[PDB]
Nucleic acid binder design. Structure first.
Ligand code: CL
Ligand code: CL
Ligand code: MN
Ligand code: MN
Ligand code: MN
Ligand code: MN
Ligand code: MN
Ligand code: MN
Ligand code: MN
Ligand code: MN
Ligand code: MN
Ligand code: MN
Ligand code: MN
Ligand code: MN
Lengths: 112, 97, 98, 87, 98, 82, 110, 95
DNA sequence: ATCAATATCCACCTGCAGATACTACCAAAAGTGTATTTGGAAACTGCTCCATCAAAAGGCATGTTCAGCTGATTCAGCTGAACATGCCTTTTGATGGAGCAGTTTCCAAATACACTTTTGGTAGTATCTGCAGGTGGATATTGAT
DNA sequence: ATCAATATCCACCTGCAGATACTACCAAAAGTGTATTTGGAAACTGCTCCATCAAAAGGCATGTTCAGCTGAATCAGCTGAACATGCCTTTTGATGGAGCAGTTTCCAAATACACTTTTGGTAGTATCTGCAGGTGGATATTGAT
């Protein structure tokens, strides 16, 4: 009846792994049995939040496969993910389409 | 001679992907970014935790360190939600032995 | 013989390039600049192709990033034309030589 | 040996046409003639600061090959953390 | 009757204050604003004397710095008068927002 | 004569900080703009400080709390320990 | 009998205390006999370097006691110390007298 | 009433070698302490990373060196690297 | 140019806030002697980096042309700087108690051990399938007149 | 407001590259469940040092006046955009060679570990004195005339 800690905690993300990586970086003398459960959840939680916003971007561009450009549109269009990943560069991500107003043509009537 | 085992979070990010978008795939590049993302956030927290434990003469990182570190590192609504999902998975794991 | 007015093709290119994610520096010229600069730090060095590509990704990202700030500085001066002094104001305020 | 051919002026491989493409992605509409040289300079500083650190790791490891991980650890140190090349 | 011209006292205040290190916000009104903002995060808090003093040193340091980069932004637009748009440009390029 | 606390940070105080930062001439709109910035700073810093306090099971925010805060906000302060 | 590791490496900085802080800083499982000597030295050197320049700034201002104002003037007027501490504030440091040119008065007969 | 260790003893020793007739305010002494802690953490930490990057369980003087190369600017680096290598040699060469 | 109104410098004094100097006691460094752990030294892989080269698209270099942007000019009206108070807030100093922090206790929870089980990462294969890029062809967008 | 040049869009169509997928399967993880200590929550106090609070004291809110700044309108020269033309370099796809990362086994140095012996460093105290302003008067700077 070997019963995964992940399964015990109700998680996809691998608690056993997260306990072993906390040990091997040391980070402290001892690691509480709850630490690697709480952390594996927070990690699962954040990857979920991104994948949902990325998938949405993929769907928005008529794609079935999330590429880097998608992940980038997700992270940069979300105010809170943008700040978390403010000092991170996503390879092959590009930038958000954004032309300063003052740069747009003004050859039409419009303003009287 | 047998190439050495280079473990990733790929298996788990994929399981989660199918939970949120059952019909959506992910490129090996995008799965790359998603691995480096977990690895990054793992350290940031484990770090803040490591420090925080020290700052209070504690030799043991508990789920109480993990949580403070998450309130310090995540902004507003990501923190609230990440703290829920944490507390919950812990409260469960406790009562699930 | 028809002619797009100054700045219409520019705007066309802004849309084109902000839409894409391909690297804008030719690969080989960039690989030589990498071997040139490194050699000058340490001789007989070798580079994993991924190490060269990692650098190119960071560099383009940095530059695109700088150019956004530069453009802001130009505009701040009531211009539309980026000049060295914009790049310099950008890099001063960034703390790259504050 | 063959001794490698001599590397010089490779900064001029960052063509005027590649520097405009980059400025376009940064949403730039009009570019002064003096920009291309200025940018070559800024790029060269950036590349140096990263390659130096990268090679510092390569040497510390006692390798003659710079890895992708050496560049990533270097970019992270410079506060230019890069996703998509390991770590 | 005697009268110094616009900017002359200003220059004098610059020289005077660039020479000193004393804090430039009165202590009490700073202490109130700190305790107020904190109350929105935890109630019935107490503050070590040093903790407020730490906050004030950091806080004034920060602003003085931002006034440098602001003033460089004003100057960049051929002005000698700092305006909000200048504080705004500085905080954008610093990465503090937008 | 009740007045907001943020308005306790007076035009002459803000003028003095601007002077140390080498500013000659000050638009009238600066003083509010400045208070708004100063508020966001303190929010960002104090939040983190208190978070340390609450971790330590204390009701007294310590210099060290602020300093540790200021260090993870990238504004590292020498002269208050650590 | 009992020699100081400090006195052995010929340092004012405490090679004992540096070793202890490296063990109990969660930096790695193991710490070589040489590392805490090397480090102690690097901290001493850098301390020496700053105090030197500060001392000089206290002498420039007719003063025998170094204050924060002296450490700020030392650091921010040295190109290499200023880069190292570019992200640091010195409480009671102030700033370097510096007034942008364009803000100085017209002047001269012309 | 518990012992609050500092570096203020060894700052003051290093002051008197360098300016034997120069003093130091408490406030300056505090900045110096922040300074030493600050650089201590910066070096120890980069050395921690290096050890991990190379699957080494041990921070040696070799790590402290690479670290000092990566964290210190040009001339500071050289002169620290020397001052270090010397102190280590002096310590080895001491029965 | 003068002349004065005010700011600025410099030399000297001196009380005390804040150094330096002194002392004793104990935490934590160092000495001693086992008890583990590690990270090259040598000896082989296979990988992947280097170089080479051939073919050809694909982008770069260059010269011409002029649209329109930059920067200079001049100016009017607006907007902050300067300036003097007495009143109002801050500051200064001293009292009582909140709470930090010192300390001992003890047990739930963490580490260490050595088995047992399962998993996830792999190499090997097959096997599908999303979409890159190419073609018409219908549909904006732009710019001149 | 017309129309012509040309860029854009979009929706199909192939043939892969890269994804998904069937194991095979097995070395390393993960985990099961004893036997440790042993970290730190908990409870108690004492003694800092923090909030308060009322006297002492010195900045700042206030309105007027106009200096000179900003921003507006104009214009000219020239810079930088666009585009046509010619063609050099990079890109793409192999190959053969080998340089060198990356693995696996001995262990002799190298740290860790448990104990003991001593002492350097702290924290109370006990004095000493650098200099922060205070004064006087000489001189510089500024601004009106
Ligand atoms: Cl726990
Ligand atoms: Cl060593
Ligand atoms: Mn879903
Ligand atoms: Mn005199
Ligand atoms: Mn030609
Ligand atoms: Mn007028
Ligand atoms: Mn009580
Ligand atoms: Mn499996
Ligand atoms: Mn397509
Ligand atoms: Mn205990
Ligand atoms: Mn002109
Ligand atoms: Mn080798
Ligand atoms: Mn002694
Ligand atoms: Mn004086």
């Amino acid at each position: 009846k070997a019963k995964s800690r992940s399964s015990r905690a109700g998680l996809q993300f691998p608690v056993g792994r997260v306990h072993r990586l906390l040990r091997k970086g040391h980070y402290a003398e001892r690691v509480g049995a709850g630490a690697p459960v709480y952390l594996a959840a927070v990690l699962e939680y954040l990857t979920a939040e991104i994948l949902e916003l990325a998938g949405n971007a993929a769907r928005d561009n008529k794609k079935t496969r999330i590429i880097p450009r998608h992940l980038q549109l997700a992270i940069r269009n979300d105010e809170e993910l943008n700040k978390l990943l403010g000092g991170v560069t996503i390879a092959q991500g590009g930038v958000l389409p954004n032309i300063q107003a003052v740069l747009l043509p003004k050859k039409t009537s419009a303003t009287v | 001679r047998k190439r050495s085992r280079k473990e990733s979070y790929s298996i788990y990010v994929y399981k989660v992907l199918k939970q949120v978008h059952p019909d959506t795939g992910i490129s090996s590049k995008a799965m790359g970014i998603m691995n480096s993302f977990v690895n990054d956030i793992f350290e940031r927290i484990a770090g803040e935790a490591s420090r925080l434990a020290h700052y209070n003469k504690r030799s043991t990182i508990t789920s109480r360190e993990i949580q403070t570190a998450v309130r310090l590192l995540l902004p507003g609504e990501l923190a609230k939600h990440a703290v829920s999902e944490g507390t919950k998975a812990v409260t469960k794991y406790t009562s699930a032995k | 013989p028809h002619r797009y007015r100054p700045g219409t093709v520019a705007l066309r290119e802004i849309r084109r390039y902000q839409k894409s994610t391909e690297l804008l520096i030719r690969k080989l010229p960039f690989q030589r600049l990498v071997r040139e600069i490194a050699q000058d730090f340490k001789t007989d060095l070798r580079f994993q192709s991924s190490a060269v590509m990692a650098l190119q990704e960071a560099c383009e990202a940095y530059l695109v990033g700088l150019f956004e700030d530069t453009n802001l500085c130009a505009i701040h001066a009531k211009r539309v034309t980026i000049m060295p002094k914009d790049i310099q104001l950008a890099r001063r305020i960034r703390g790259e030589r504050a | 040996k063959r001794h490698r051919k001599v590397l010089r002026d490779n900064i001029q491989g960052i063509t005027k046409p590649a520097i405009r493409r980059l400025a376009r992605r940064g949403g730039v509409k009009r570019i002064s003639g003096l920009i291309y040289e200025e940018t070559r300079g800024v790029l060269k500083v950036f590349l140096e600061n990263v390659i130096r650190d990268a090679v510092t790791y390569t040497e510390h490891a006692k390798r003659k090959t710079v890895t992708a991980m050496d560049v990533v650890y270097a970019l992270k140190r410079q506060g230019r953390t890069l996703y998509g090349f390991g770590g």
